[PDB]
Paper text:
No culturable Bacteroidete has yet conclusively been shown to deconstruct cellulose via the actions of a PUL7, but we recently identified and characterized a chitin utilization locus (ChiUL) from the aerobic soil bacterium [name]. The [name] ChiUL consists of 11 genes: two SusC/D-like pairs for oligosaccharide capture and transport, an inner membrane transporter, a two-component sensor/regulator pair, and four enzymes. Here we present the crystal structures of the FjChiB chitinase and the [name] chitobiase, as well as a small-angle X-ray scattering (SAXS) envelope of the novel FjChiA_M domain.
The fourth enzyme, the [name] chitobiase/N-acetylglucosaminidase, was active only on CHOs. Thus, to illuminate these features we pursued structural determination of the [name] by X-ray crystallography and were able to solve the protein structure from diffraction data extending to 1.70 Å resolution. The crystallographic asymmetric unit contained two protein molecules whose interaction gives rise to a buried surface area of ~ 11%, as determined by PISA21. Analysis of the protein in solution by size exclusion chromatography was consistent with a monomer unit being the prominent species (≥ 80%) and thus the dimer observed in the crystal structure is likely not of biological relevance. Each protomer consists of three domains: a central domain (residues 145–502) composed of a (β/α)8 TIM-barrel, an N-terminal domain (residues 1–144) comprising a six-stranded β-sheet and two α-helices where the helices are sandwiched between the β-sheet and the central domain, and a C-terminal domain (residues 504–673) consisting of an eight-helix bundle with two short β-strands. Several of the active site residues shown to be important for substrate binding and catalysis in GH20 members are conserved in [name], including the H-x-G-G-D-E motif where a glutamic acid (Glu317) is proposed to act as a general acid/base in the reaction. The [name] substrate-binding pocket is distinct in one significant way compared to the archetypical GH20 from S. marcescens (SmGH20)20,25 in that [name] lacks the extended loop that is located between β-strand 7 and α-helix 7 in SmGH20. Interestingly, a portion of a loop extending from the [name] helical bundle domain wraps around, and closes off, one side of the active site cleft in the TIM barrel with a tyrosine residue (Tyr538) that projects its sidechain into a position similar to the Trp685 residue in SmGH20. The [name] C-terminal helical bundle is a distinct domain amongst structurally determined GH20 family members.
Residue numbers in the entry:
A (entry chain B), B (entry chain A): 1 to 251, 270 to 673
Amino acid sequence: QMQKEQLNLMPWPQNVVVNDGNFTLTKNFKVNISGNPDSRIFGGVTRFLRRLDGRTGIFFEQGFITKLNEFPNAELQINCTKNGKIGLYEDESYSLDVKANKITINATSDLGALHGLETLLQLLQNDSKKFYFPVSQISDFPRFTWRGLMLDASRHFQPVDVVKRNLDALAAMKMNVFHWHLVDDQGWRIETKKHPKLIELASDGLYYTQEEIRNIVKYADERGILIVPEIDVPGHGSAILTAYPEIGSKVTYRIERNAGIFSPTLDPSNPKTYKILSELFDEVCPLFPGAYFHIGGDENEGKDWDANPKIQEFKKKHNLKTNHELQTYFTMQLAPMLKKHGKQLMGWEEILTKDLSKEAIVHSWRGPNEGMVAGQSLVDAVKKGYKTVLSNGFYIDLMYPVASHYLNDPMPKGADLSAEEKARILGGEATMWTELATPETFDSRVWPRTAAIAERLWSAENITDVANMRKRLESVSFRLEELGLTHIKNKAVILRNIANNQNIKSVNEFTNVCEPLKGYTRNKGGTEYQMYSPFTLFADACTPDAKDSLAFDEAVSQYLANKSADNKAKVAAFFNKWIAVNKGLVELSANAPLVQPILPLSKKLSDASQELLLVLDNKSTLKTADLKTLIEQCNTKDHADVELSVYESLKKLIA
Amino acid sequence: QMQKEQLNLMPWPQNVVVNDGNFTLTKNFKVNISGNPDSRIFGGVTRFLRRLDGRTGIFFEQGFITKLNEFPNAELQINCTKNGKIGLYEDESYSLDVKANKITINATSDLGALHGLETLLQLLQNDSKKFYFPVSQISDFPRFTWRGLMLDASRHFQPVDVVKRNLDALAAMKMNVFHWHLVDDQGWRIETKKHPKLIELASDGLYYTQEEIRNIVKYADERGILIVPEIDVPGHGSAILTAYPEIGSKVTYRIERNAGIFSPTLDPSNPKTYKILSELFDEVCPLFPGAYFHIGGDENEGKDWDANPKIQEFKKKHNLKTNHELQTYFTMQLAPMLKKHGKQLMGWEEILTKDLSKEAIVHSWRGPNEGMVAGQSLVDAVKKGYKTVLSNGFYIDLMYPVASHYLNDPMPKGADLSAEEKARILGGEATMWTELATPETFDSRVWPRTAAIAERLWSAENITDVANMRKRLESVSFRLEELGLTHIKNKAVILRNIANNQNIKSVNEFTNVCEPLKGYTRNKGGTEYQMYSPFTLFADACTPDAKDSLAFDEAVSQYLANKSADNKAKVAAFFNKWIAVNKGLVELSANAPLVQPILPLSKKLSDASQELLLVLDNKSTLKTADLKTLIEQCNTKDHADVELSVYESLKKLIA
C-alpha cells in the first residue's frame, strides 16, 4: 500500500515498483550467497548485516559471512553470476526483489550485489514496533561508469581514518572512484624511499606510508572502488621544488602555507626533471593497480617559463608556440613512462592541445570561476576524440548550495553530440580541495552534498526534482553516521568550543540560519587562513542549505501564496525563535569570547525579526526605506566568515 | 582575578600558588625552547600551540616548531635540562611560572615540559572578550611512576585511530603507560609474518600491522608514553589454539564469540609450546622497544591440565604440586626468552608462586569480584619482594561510579609496609576490557572516568574531595574533545539511531537519569552479547554518574535536611521534567522501534513523579504500602540493560 514517493532511495534506482505487503524483519533473518562472486562479497555482506543490526537491534544469528551456500533456505538470497573486476565499464547492474517471505538480489557480479545491499538498507521501513521492507522490485544500473570523489591530501593532510570512512560512504552512495590528490604546493604525501627528500623536506612529517597505500587500495577494492592517484605536475610545484630546487624553472622554494596559485613550476627543458619523475613512477605506480594515473597539469601560470631563456630556446627547438603546447609536450614525455607500468594518463584540461594523445583522459574543471563556459572544455574534448570526466560544477569545497551540484549534468545541453561523443563522457567527480577543511571538518563539507552528486552520476538524467531530492537526503545523511562520518557530530564539538561548554542550544540554532561564505570569499586572497590556522570557529560549524533557512524559505513561500492564519503562524514562529536565539547568544557571550564575532549578526536578525512580526500584522510604521535598510543589514558578509541565508526570504516578505 | 579554588587543573598539581594579575593572550604570543631536550619536545610544543589556537581563535604567527631558540624573547619559554627517556623512574617534574608578561616552563627533561604544557592549557581562563592565564607558580611531579591505561584490542578490535587519540588523551592527563592487550580468546591482533596462521585463522582480518605497531610506538614516544605489550599465556588460549591446536592441553578450537572464562590452555609439557612462543617473541619483541613484556597469566582454571595424563606426569617429574606452581614454571621458561630481547617479565597476579623470579612485575587485579580482599595480592607481592602495579579497583569496563575509582589507592592502608616495600608499588592502571565496547563506544567508557584515575596516580595522596574532583572534571572532559575523543559526540549518534533521526531531546534527557547495568550483569553469563552484536542502543548511550541523577540526589538531600519552599520546588522541578521526558519518548516511539525498550522504564519514573508531586503537596491519598510499591518499580533492572540511578533518592523521599 505505501507510495513510491515515501521511499528514501539515493541514488534513485532506474526502475522501481512497490506492491501491497511487507517482508517483516525478525530474529530469523539470515543471508545466503550463491553463484560465482569475487571474494569481496563476503566482507560486504558481513558489513551489511552489521549495519542492519545496528539500526534494528535484532541480534542476528550470523557473525562473519565467509563462504557460499551457508544457508540455502535463508530469507535473503544473493546470486552473483561472475567475479567483478575493479575498473571502468564493468557491469554494475542488479535486481532486488522483496517478497513477503524472501528477498532476492541478482547481479551479474558482486559489484552489482554490493550496490543492491545499499538499496536494500535504504528500503528499511518501520512502525512503532517493527522493521520491514515493502514488497517491491527494483532493477538498476548506473548512468555513468566514472562516479568519483577527489580527496586533496596536500592542503590539509587527511589521515587513514578519514580516507577509510569516506570509502565506506562512497560505497554507500554507489560511487566507484576515489581520486587521491597526493601532492600540491602545501605538501607531498607519498612515502618514497628512492627520493627521501620529498618526505624529509616537503611533508612536515605528514604522509601515507607505502603499506598504508596498499592497504587503502585493498579496502577500496573490497568495496568496489577504483583508486586513481594524482601527482600534479608541472605546476603546483612548491613542495616538489623544496626537495629538488634544481629542477625548478626560476632562473628559494618552501612548503606553501597559504592558499592560491603559485609560481614554482618544474622545468620541462631539464633532463633531470624527467629522470626524477620516471624514478617516481617506478616507485609509486606499483602501489596503485588501477589503470589510470593522473598527472595533474592545472594552473601553470607560465611566468617562470616566460622569463627563462633556456626554456624559450627549448620551445623554439620543438616548434612549441605557447606554454600550453610546451606543457603538452612535457606531458607526452610522461606518457610512455606510465605506459611502461601499464597505465593510461589522465590530466586536468589544460593538458589538451593538438599533440596530446587521444588515449589521454581529460579532466574538465574550468567554468565561470575561470572565465569559461561551464562544461565547454568537456564538449570540446569529446568532439576531438578524448574520453573526459567532468568536475566543473562539482567543486564542493566552495560551499555552494546543493542544488547547484545536483543539477550539474556531465552531458552538455545542445552540442548535437554523436553517440560516439556521448560515450566518451566517462562521468563526473566531486572535488574536495582542502585549503579550508581539516580532518575534523572534512566530512561536514563532503556530506551530504556529495550524496546528491552521487544521484546525478548514477540515476536517470530526468531525476531532477530538487525538493524530492532534499526529502530523501535527510535519511541518507543520517544513515551515513553509522560509517563514522562526522558531518553532524563534529559540529557539536565546535559549538562546545565556541560556547566554552555552556548550553549550546542557541549557538546551534543560529548555525541553522547561517552559511559559510561561498566561492573564494572566506579566505580572501588566500592569506587569511594558513594550512595550520584554527578551524574550530563558527564558520566551521556552519554548512550550506542551513536547515532553518530552508524551512523558513518554504514557510514564507507557502504563506505568500496563501496568507492563512496557520501559514502566517508558521512564519512568525521563526521570528520569535530568532529573538530568543539572540538573547541566548548575548548571555553565552558573557563567558565565551568566541561568541563575540556572531553577536552583530544575531542582533541584526533579531532587529529585523521584531519588525517583521509587526509587518505580518500590518502594524509596522517604519517608512518604506527604513524597513528596506533594516532588512538589508542582514545581508552583511562582514561577521565570522558566514552569511544569513534567510535574507532573501526577509526581502520577499517586505512586500 | 582568580583564586586557586576556581582552577580546573587535573591531576591537581603538587604545589599551586596564585598571585595577583593575569597574562593576556594576544596575537604577539610565541613559544621558544631552550636547553637540551629530546626532539619529542618539538611536536609536543607544536600541538600545544595548535590546541591553544583552536580554543582561542587568535591565529598565532608560528606554524611548526622544529628547532631550539627560534624566538629568544618569546612570551612562553620552555627550558629543558636534558633528554628524557621513555620508561619508568624518570624525573617527570616541572615548574610553571606565569607572570604578567612572560611564562616559563622549566623541567629536568622534555618529559616534564610536555606535562607542563598540559597544565598550562588547563590554566587558560577567559572573560567575555579575552583569554588569559592567572599569574601563578606551580611546581609538580608524579606520585607514582607507572600511570597506565590498558586497551583490550582482542574482544573488540580497536583501530589505529582509536589507539592514537587515546594516547593523546593519556598525555593530556599526564599518564605515561599504555598497556596493549593484543591477544585473548576472541582474537590475535599482531601481524606475524613468520606465524601467519595466527592472522589467517585467529584474527577475522582485524589486526595491527608491524609497521602500524612501530608507528604507534613512535606516536606514543613522542608523547612521553611507554608501551607495554601483552601476549596472554597460557590461559585465554582459544585464538592461539585455533591457529596451533597441537600445543593445546585438551586430550577443535575456534575464535571465541562470547564473553567469559574459557578452557583452551597452552600445554606447558609440550616442547613445541616453548618453541612457538620463543619464535613469537623473536618476531614481536623487536617491535616494542620498552623494557617490559606482559605475558598475561590470568584465569587458567586448570581443567584441561587436571585431565591430561601427560601434564600430570610432567608435574610429578618437576615436583610441581599445584596448577599455579606449574604455571609459574611455564612462566619462568619464558623469562630467559624475554631477557634475550632485553625485556623484563610482567604478568597477572596468578603467576606469583614461590619460584617466580623477584625480577618479575606482578599485576594485581583480583579483589571482591573474585572473592578476595581488594589490594591484598599487591600487599602480599611487595612483602615478598616483587614490584607491583595495581589494577584492581580501576576496572572501568564494569561501569562503576567514578568515586569508586577515584578513591582506590595503590598504597594499601594498615599494612605497616617498609619504605623498601612502598617503593615496590610502581603505580596503577585503568583496564579497558572490550567485551562491551566497540570503537564507537570505547571513549564513552574510558573518559572521563580515567581522568579521575589519572589524578589518583599523579597527585598527592590527600587529594580525595570527590565533589571538587567532579567540578574540575567537567572542563577536563570537554577539552579532551579537541583530541578527537568521542565520549560526548558519539552519544548523539546513538541517540539519533534510537530516535530514527527525530528530535533527540527527550531521549538525551532520559540518558541523564539512567546508567548501564554494573559489574557482570549487563551481559549475563557472557552469552547475551557476542563480539559482533549491535552496541547502538540505549545502554550504549548511557554512562555512570548520570548528571541529572546526581543533581536530583543533591536536591533531595538538601530538602530532607531543610524542607523549605525553595528546596521543595527544586525537587518538584525534576518530577515535572521527567513527566515531560516520558511524554516526549512516547511521541518519538510512534516512529522509532528502538525507543520501545525504554518506555516501560520512563513510564515507571513518570508514574512515580506524578504521585510524588502530590506527596510533596500532601494531596496524595495513595496508601503507604502502595506508594512504596510504586517507587520500587523504579529499581527494575529488566529494561534496556540500564537502571534508574534516581531510585535511591526516590526511596529516601518516602521513608
